[PDB]
Design a protein around this ligand. Structure first.
Ligand SMILES: [Mg+2]
Ligand SMILES: [Mg+2]
Lengths: 521, 524, 521
């Protein structure tokens, strides 16, 4: 745990940031025999072993070796080095080592289409790259100056550590490039600086952190910058950090039972698999909070999860009382913002947030923007735009797209939203998921979810637009289209009653625009 | 309501501020015949009459006359001119006309005790002072270069208007002084600049935040800067404002029926009286929202009040829908903060119980401070300090007291508080009302409120700090005092035999630390 | 010329910027029948004429016609429109019209090689380009959406001016892309925003301009952003502005005699070419100031120029008294920093500056940097760094180069420098011109200059480094080379003997490290 002296020590350190957390820990003279992060043994250390618990001393050793190797291969400050791996621990070691020479680690998801990955990295102008074995063939044989794997980095390379190591980042110096998951086409490459990747975290520490933090289980996809964001925060707090790679419910559950984390970090899809598992055989007692990043988690999964473990609340005598149940926090955000900008907590008793994502974090500044970038008054639909010291300085090597996605000084998250009178924001939908129909704007995700939540005989359903030729009828667009729904029943109990009237009865109940027709599958 | 072009004009105005709103209205070319202020007939116009509805152009004419007049009395930029009156509209006219000269109008509560008012105004360095005919004797006969009343200002004085009028304020020039509302002996003079008084207002105007401020009924004590905040904000929005001077529940209620306001602004005492009335006789089909500052409004009242009128909401289709009920914003803050800092809306169905004041405004920044002046981890008790661009530059002519009420960069509100892990703030108590016994600290107003809904046979109780005949044991003091339970039984029965244990069981059942006795005074 | 009330109105305009000077001029109600722009007639107006003097109202007509045209061509905010012309006035009209749409005009020097012009623009992502007649074939027939010239823009297209015109720029919105002169290879595209391109001008407008900017002759190359800077500043001052396209000294001299400027703006090459001319036949009686951007002008020439015209010094009664001579201001600036950061004012009889350049403009921060980005103390040589609210946000679509050119939060000018203990900065040489020897650091240009100014039997000499192939020895390098000075004795010069010991004499007699060898040609 962190003392008050250490807490002051962190806040007093104007050099600390995303490029030197490891090195400031050494400057604080932290105990080096302390085990600091736990792994799923998916990363090969230089000695050939696959460490499952790593001490601060060994972390210095491993990072110095890697840094030595890359200097070896010619890596200088402001060079780009691709990291294409599935292993969270591998992401994290190459992240810190490349950082420490002043070069820029560029995370790619291991499961991009190989031509996409290859060209995604050529466009950054990278000097070379490291992969895991299964991805090695995706980059080797091309134009990169080196394409190595963990087997290539060996203890002798630690002797090549340059004079003056580690690098001394200015706040504005890039320390990572990463891309958001779930995209189509070429992912946009998002850089983050020494200052920005850690801003929100270091803001917390300047006052108080919530839920302590305890033992952190990082089950976020390791290519996402949040994995590094959380991991370094945990290193600073002297909280143990487990770097879980697989986003698969069962594997994460095995991790919870062996690591006994007090806080879990993950994506919706993982929380969903967990909440539909047979939890009655799982020791979740250690858990006190989950954080979810990216798309919001599903309220029925959340209800299953907050029932596990326990959290402390402020008692009536103003002292902590433990109570049954955990706290699941949804955090709307992006790779571009380096942290969540809005927060939505769910306790066991908590009420439905509906579509309300509340107010932005104090350091951020959001708005609902007209098409010409003025804020709209409460009650009107527009583009959600954020301002923040955690915001990226702009897509790597793509100025043109950066500024296309800026409006009135705000970055555009790509969501549609409105404000109420008290100044809370409401997430309506992704802009490209709005369909302009003659009944009005169908929000496809709101529709799909309302339907699935009202008709239990449906196993899935899907809104899809159908316009005339070439017509574009999303939010950014001009035209109109009809919105057809594709249903997928469970085991029976079909309502041949119109289908289309069946589903437009629900939509009408909520005031939603109807869909043109609803077809089974 | 205010149009798109109008708000853009107000956001593109780099001169707009609490020193010149009236003249910026004139600059935006607004219709001069529009009624813009509604009074209660307590202010004497320069023609002798008592107008009840003032239009924008008439308002130019009055403020010009009062400007020319004070100019004729020798008033220059950066002079103080005191304002001791009971009429909210009289506070208003003097505020803008004194401001329009670069001089700092200084508000003082009419009902202040004679020796206090005269001293408070004298230590400011005021060049003079205006009074309503009642409080005249309180300031006259002293060192003020003048002491005047409305009748002393005739139409003729309009021609005295200095060339170059009106003043061009710098953001950091002062435009008001005003004091708080607790007779801690001598009130503290709080100045506010061209920029701080309207900061919150203009920040929400730049972000279109707000809504449901069609007709504003300002029942705040006119001597308090917030009265001018709210009036000017309304002027800017082009929203009828009504300047109710008395906080008699009855009077404010008659105002709700005459003015038909959409938003109502007052101090807690007013709401406390209005809630406990026969609301069946009253016509409140206008009220959508309440605003309350100064004292926290007790939840038992707030629930009576959110019952009236209607307000819009976002229905499931993401369209506005009108629902019965009203919103009761309770915002903390103090005279020093210019605007409320924390906030606490309340609807018909409410759960924001329990001293929880929410989170601070985005432009502001709060903390729960140690004695070393550092922010605590959640769950720990300390002193609540704040930081804000709405904050005052510091107590007028009292720098010693100013820096004594500041810690680690924050201005201390003198409240104790704690945070939950989600960063909400809970208002334990005013630090004077803190008594450290043996077991732990017992919060006094919390020990007085734990005999409300747990020991229901008293119309009041108090906790007192009698240690030695002056040996303190407060939060800031380092000693141990005896906290006490002092009761008040109304007529009937209910009274048991034990004069000590009846108050100790409810305290132990809600986690509280020890009392030590109890008695029964008369009502004297 | 302009009043105090107009000057306060400007200084009180929170919307004034590089994207709407023309539109703010109208908001201020400037008279429209008044001339404001003088040309050399190299630009075809929409009606086919070639105006030589343009009223402010006629300017509104041209820009609106061009705005209506680009609007019907499909140009939307944040689009990029290449401008490839030799006409300053054509650069200027297009810059304002493409601005007003929210689109981004990209200037390119007309003399770029076709294979490079084509690609420089393609890399930006432009939707289209306008060219003068000569350069249409350079971009025509490409992947570009359109390639037009001024013959394509008739008065009809003014009817196409869109709803809501002109654009309302956020301070951070891009409003120009241009590049620098004197580069080899692919020039670097420098973008500037609504608030950076005019920031030094608006800031110096919080000081009395006093009337030294009475009639500006802008003879800077048209593709250069300084030329738009000076133009817009002049417009704001209600100072006539002449847009001379040619940099040939004789053409700028014909311009000086015609327009009778009070302040001239050029590049040192223009100035040199003027200073070496038979000034006798020339009226230059109107000049009170020259201004020179980028590279300092040869002080030899400067002396000849400040000889011309008269200026105004302050009198004992505190009203201005007119004295003979003029003021020539060197200002090391760049495309990236825009204005000059540094000012070196020369007037008649003033002392030579040597290698001093003074202190930076109050709004910028400059430093001599260690290789890890720390400011150095007086005495030591390091890399010259600059921070300024006038700095570009970074090269367009080339994040990689942008951060390669940054150090400890500063932008690198490319120069080596040191400070005296009084604060002033001294420019030693270009970081690629330093030669790492064992004689020490030999500054290529300083050695060349010293020799060519002390032993007058030379017309030119040249210092080059000779080291093992692959070894880099240029400050940025780690290895070492040997310095050779190749001598070119004048026609009939009394070519002596030895040589190596001849140059080593004069260069070691002023302190300079020794050269390895000296040969001829
Ligand atoms: Mg909702
Ligand atoms: Mg979808």
């Amino acid at each position: 745990m962190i003392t008050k002296e250490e807490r002051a020590q962190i806040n007093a350190d104007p050099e600390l940031g995303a490029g030197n957390v490891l090195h400031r820990l050494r400057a604080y003279g932290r105990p080096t025999d302390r085990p600091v992060l736990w792994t799923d043994g998916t990363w090969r250390a230089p000695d050939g072993s696959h460490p499952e618990v790593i001490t601060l001393g060994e972390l210095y050793e491993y990072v110095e070796t890697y840094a030595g190797f890359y200097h070896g291969k010619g890596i200088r400050p402001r060079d780009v080095v691709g990291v294409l791996t599935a292993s969270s621990t591998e992401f994290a070691i190459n992240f810190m080592a490349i950082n420490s020479l002043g070069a820029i680690p560029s995370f790619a998801n291991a499961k991009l289409r190989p031509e996409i990955a290859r060209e995604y990295i050529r466009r950054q102008g990278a000097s070379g790259a490291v992969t895991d074995t299964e991805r090695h063939e995706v980059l080797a044989g091309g134009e990169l100056g080196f394409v190595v794997t963990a087997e290539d980095i060996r203890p002798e390379h630690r002797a090549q550590l340059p004079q003056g190591w580690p690098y001394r980042h200015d706040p504005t110096d890039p320390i990572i490039i990463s891309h958001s998951s779930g995209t189509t086409g070429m992912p946009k490459a998002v850089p983050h600086t020494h200052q920005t990747l850690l801003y929100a975290q270091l803001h917390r520490l300047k006052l108080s952190v919530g839920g302590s933090m305890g033992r952190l289980l990082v089950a976020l996809p390791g290519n996402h910058n949040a994995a590094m964001s959380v991991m370094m925060f945990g290193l600073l707090l002297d909280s143990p950090v487990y770097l879980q790679s697989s986003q698969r419910g069962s594997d994460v559950l095995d991790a919870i039972e062996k690591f006994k984390p007090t806080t879990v970090f993950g994506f919706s899809g993982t929380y969903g698999q967990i909440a539909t598992s047979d939890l009655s055989t799982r020791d979740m007692s250690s858990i006190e909070a989950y954080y979810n990043t990216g798309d919001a988690a599903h309220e029925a999964h959340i209800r299953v999860l907050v029932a596990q473990g326990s959290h402390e609340e402020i008692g009536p005598d103003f002292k902590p009382v433990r109570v049954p149940g955990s706290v699941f926090t949804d955090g709307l955000g992006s790779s571009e913002t380096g942290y969540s900008i809005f927060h939505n907590g769910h306790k066991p008793g908590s009420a439905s947030f509906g579509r309300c994502i509340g107010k932005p974090m104090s350091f951020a500044q959001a708005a609902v923007l007209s098409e010409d970038g003025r804020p709209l008054p409460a009650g009107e639909v527009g583009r959600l735009g954020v301002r923040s010291p955690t915001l990226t300085p702009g897509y790597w090597n793509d100025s043109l797209t950066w500024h296309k996605l800026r409006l009135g000084g705000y970055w555009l998250t790509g969501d549609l939203a409105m404000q109420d009178a008290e100044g809370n924001f409401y997430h309506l939908d992704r802009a490209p998921d709005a369909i302009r129909t003659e009944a009005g704007i169908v929000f496809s995700t709101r529709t799909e979810e309302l339907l699935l939540a009202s008709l239990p005989e449906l196993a899935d359903c899907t809104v899809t637009a159908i316009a005339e030729e070439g017509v574009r009828a999303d939010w950014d667009g001009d035209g109109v289209a009809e919105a057809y729904v594709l249903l997928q029943f469970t085991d029976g109990a079909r309502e041949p009653g119109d289908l289309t009237g069946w589903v437009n009865e629900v939509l009408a109940g909520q005031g939603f625009p109807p869909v043109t027709r609803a077809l089974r599958m």
